[PDB]
Design a protein around this ligand. Structure first.
Ligand SMILES: C=CC1=C(C)/C(=C/c2[nH]c(/C=C3N=C(/C=C4\NC(=O)C(C)=C4C=C)C(C)=C\3CCC(=O)O)c(CCC(=O)O)c2C)NC1=O
Ligand SMILES: C=CC1=C(C)/C(=C/c2[nH]c(/C=C3N=C(/C=C4\NC(=O)C(C)=C4C=C)C(C)=C\3CCC(=O)O)c(CCC(=O)O)c2C)NC1=O
Ligand SMILES: C=CC1=C(C)/C(=C/c2[nH]c(/C=C3N=C(/C=C4\NC(=O)C(C)=C4C=C)C(C)=C\3CCC(=O)O)c(CCC(=O)O)c2C)NC1=O
Ligand SMILES: C=CC1=C(C)/C(=C/c2[nH]c(/C=C3N=C(/C=C4\NC(=O)C(C)=C4C=C)C(C)=C\3CCC(=O)O)c(CCC(=O)O)c2C)NC1=O
Lengths: 169, 169, 169, 169
């Protein structure tokens, strides 16, 4: 997680968020530097859960070529705020996951923040239904992040090159 | 839940709790009065989840023969305390679910408490792998409950009569 | 607190809440039935704290003339939401305290809610800088309460009779 | 805060913790690297609160000679665990504060940890009633920290030199 001064911001989340349309495969396009993702080519796959919420399967390609994956569960603890989820990953304490913006069919912007006294730790990802996302969309989503304090100059661009990411089966 | 004086107790939980062995069908035998269950013949079915934790399917037989069911997800938010679960039901805020005692194949004692200032609200249930449980076991588990202040005078016996509950299957 | 169906509502809180102006003495005028206050003539006194937040001293007149008092501390855990406080009373778990509406010099409407699964427990109080409050103000504040589902049928009127409450001073 | 892999540990805390004997001045002797303390000569002063808990006044000498201070409130949210406090500092989100070990008259060992998914952020301090602490005591307290995972090789020694710290009025 990206540790910075100041308490967590509280950005607005996707109005009328429909988890049913959010399921499926999302490709990581840009992200803040964090501790969890040590590689490239990252995807998140969200699938139906027989309980509440949905289930999570994230995969990425490490620099050595190994595919690393993690499973988790996603739950909206307050059903009146379906876009404010809590993610429970194997071997991890709970972390928030807020869908800030999505059209379900092309892009989403997701954000997570944990307070650390007078500082905070945040995740943030622009994701796409395809390995790429149009630059106009990326710029708009960067606009949203800057509005609530995210230094978009620290954003990392995720490698989704078809050849490099062919290790992703 | 109904309200009793005092903050929540912190009873001991099942040592080395094994959620895989806890899965399957459990019959409600006795419980504290609460608002959630308005019927009889109650069962809880716990099943594999593709994410973390396990999935929840509770069923009961309402008085006009309807079978009311609720879905949920169960997660141990601290993996080092696997008997202290959080249950997320559709249309409910999160609630604790602590497995205080179980031999997995016959009985379990489950406890849930939420603080209300200087008072608290609790659920507590004796459950069985069969629609009945031996009086000796019931009495021992009531002893456990009384050791952290649960008045056994308040426990309701659930109707598990075979004829009455036949529509459950 | 006593239990009502539904999860907690999230009513709007006093904009630009100024805790310095909120300090001093407040008289209980009307409130939801609860377990905490068993007496009449109730007042809350809020005072400067050398740390953060402010200090709490509640007093009431018990039926056998005893003046029961409780001490506490009030803290706005998120400084950006100063009207959403947490109250820490001696011998109580933390409880929310939301200033929904106040003009500081005449009236305030305070609300506290804790989720109990699909149900909730709430406190709600109309308070005044005087032992009485005009009927017009009381009626407006009941309107606010009814807008987030508080049944005004349930509100108790607090005894603030001057003769009866004389031992308060 | 010191950000490291793994979830927070849960060390044992001081049995029978008596906040009344913990009040007064404590000198920082050794600490984990963190973001809050940017200087040396640090002291914490704990004083009586008219509410619950106690009030907090921390001071340190920056490298430029300026004295920097912060005020806060300390509260045991669960009165049955008086050694597990929550500290509310001005401009800061709440952070835990656990008194692991103290004899009140000479030393204390304090610990704070916040989970960050599969990682965590921790504070830890050895403090003394005097600007120094005997090496035998320091080694014992380092022994306690290593037992629950704290790499005592990362500990910083706080400058409490009488000349350098004379800026502390
Ligand atoms: C912004 C929200 C966000 C949250 C809440 C988050 C939490 C999070 N992601 C994790 C792993 C992971 N997270 C991802 C990828 C993603 N994870 C996502 O939420 C998204 C959108 C992607 C991109 C598709 C991968 C691939 C892993 C496994 C990393 C590995 O084990 O090598 C872990 C486990 C920590 C670990 O094992 O080291 C946590 C707690 N990561 C985030 O980016
Ligand atoms: C002791 C712990 C305990 C907890 C934490 C609990 C929580 C709980 N049970 C619920 C429903 C329910 N709970 C049950 C039955 C059970 N539920 C159980 O945890 C067990 C062991 C049984 C019995 C085998 C049933 C049948 C319902 C559906 C009731 C209804 O709304 O019609 C709900 C509301 C779901 C909703 O309608 O939104 C909650 C919050 N009940 C408990 O008894
Ligand atoms: C509406 C919000 C509200 C909250 C959050 C609340 C919480 C609350 N009030 C308490 C006591 C008390 N609360 C009051 C009176 C008041 N308390 C107030 O917040 C107000 C506005 C008044 C009236 C002016 C009194 C007199 C006591 C002591 C009651 C007793 O235990 O004898 C306690 C228990 C303290 C203890 O004995 O351990 C709690 C948890 N009461 C409320 O009414
Ligand atoms: C191990 C527990 C521990 C906790 C929970 C902790 C929290 C904490 N300490 C802070 C400041 C501070 N904390 C201290 C010193 C101390 N603070 C202490 O808890 C102790 C024992 C000392 C030593 C006497 C000082 C001097 C400051 C002010 C730093 C500054 O503003 O320059 C802040 C405010 C953050 C900021 O303004 O940047 C927090 C949240 N620090 C800790 O060391």
């Amino acid at each position: 997680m990206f540790i910075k001064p100041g308490r967590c911001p509280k950005p607005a989340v996707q109005e009328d968020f429909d988890a049913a349309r959010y399921l499926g495969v999302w490709y990581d396009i840009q992200r803040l530097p964090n501790k969890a993702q040590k590689g490239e080519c990252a995807t998140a796959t969200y699938s139906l859960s027989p309980g509440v919420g949905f289930s999570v399967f994230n995969r990425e390609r490490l620099a050595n070529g190994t595919i690393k994956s993690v499973i988790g569960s996603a739950i909206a603890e307050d059903p009146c705020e379906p876009a404010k989820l809590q993610f429970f990953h194997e071997n991890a304490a709970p972390v928030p996951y807020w869908v800030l913006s999505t059209d379900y069919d092309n892009y989403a912007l997701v954000y997570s923040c944990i307070n650390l006294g007078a500082s905070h730790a945040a995740y943030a990802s622009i994701v796409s239904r395809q390995p790429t996302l149009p630059e106009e969309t990326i710029k708009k989503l960067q606009g949203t992040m800057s509005s609530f304090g995210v230094g978009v100059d620290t954003l990392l661009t995720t490698n989704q090159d078809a050849a490099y990411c062919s290790a992703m089966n």
